[PDB]
Amino acid sequence: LFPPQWICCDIRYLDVSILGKFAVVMADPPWDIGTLTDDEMRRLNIPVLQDDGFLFLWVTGRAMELGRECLNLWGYERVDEIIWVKTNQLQRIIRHWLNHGKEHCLVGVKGNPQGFNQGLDCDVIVAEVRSTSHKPDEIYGMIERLSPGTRKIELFGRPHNVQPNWITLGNQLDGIHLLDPDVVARFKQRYPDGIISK
Amino acid sequence: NDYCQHFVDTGHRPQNFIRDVLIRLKDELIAKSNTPPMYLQADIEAFDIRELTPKFDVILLEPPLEEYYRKCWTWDDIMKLEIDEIAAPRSFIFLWCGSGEGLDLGRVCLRKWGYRRCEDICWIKTNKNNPLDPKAVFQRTKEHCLMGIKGTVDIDLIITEEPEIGNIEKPVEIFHIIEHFCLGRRRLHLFGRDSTIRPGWLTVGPTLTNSNYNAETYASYFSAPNSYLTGCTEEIERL
């Protein structure tokens, strides 16, 4: 259901089967380059979140390789790689061996998605650094034009990430805010006392 | 405030709006350290690379991928190259991987040849002068050059205008990035061309029209006292 929804939770322990299926998954995970170990990242129950659709996965450093590993382990094929060129308010680049002017977002596909608007946007984003750790808001527009009106889910999102058509998961969100009747019903059953442990 | 939306509306790529896209002397020492250009025509699929000696400090590998055209080398062919047999125990690779499956298979290659990736250099192509793989989700507007290391003021971005159709040349700026690293003087460009021959580099490829390569002449550029020069320091004084 259209308006933003979110679950404050530990993504390692939430039973995500209650959430249903999504046209798009996005994650800006805390790779161990509070972080998650490689094994914890590998063990995330991504496979149950989609049958046919796309994954957007931010990577940096050795997670350029580890994120590819997770991607394939979760059942995705990497079919694009978005590059975010980091600028200031005057559109100049924010300048080990080389200075880094960009961040990478791997794009995975699972199944055979039908009815997506592939090819409308290009794979370079030019956008201003806001806070440290934030990713540009432009990615939501790209994803919306790609798959308009469909259900989407973000993992490790923060309050600024909540968006219409998105369910946002993360341990820095404020409580639980669910409005999709299917999801509310399955959440009550799975978590009658509202507690997400173990 | 949304060059992605702008690109959808007008066809102008977001990179077209990046602006502004003490530096020399180091360049001048690089030029003084540079060996004469050496080059050899060789059909690399039929050619035993181990004839190329001594072992190289830097390998720039530029196989002609089919995606460049819209004899091509597949990632099957490239991965079977015996790159580890000619790389020095401490040495660097720069691999042009295109924009498709090469981003993954190129990493497989690097690991197969004994490297770990330290950098991902993205050649971003503007379309200021003219505002599709079936698996593609987005219009592809860049290429990746992966940098690998084996053993124990530049940015990871090159921005130029998209070259004319049928032009498969990569931006010469990659050579400046590599040479500013000061990695050594034995530098090999595989699948280079007449148009890419360059001081300080040995170019090997099928389309070269002439050769001047001699293994004993080549080796003598790196004989003592010059065995360990970075390529960024003064020549060692003689007689």
Ligand SMILES: Nc1ncnc2c1ncn2[C@@H]1O[C@H](C(=O)NC2CCNCC2)[C@@H](O)[C@H]1O
């Ligand atoms: N086990 C967890 N479950 C739910 N959320 C978690 C868990 N661990 C950490 N987080 C939260 O993910 C967010 C984050 O680390 N973003 C950075 C990822 C790298 N690039 C910079 C942003 C933070 O909000 C953090 O508190």
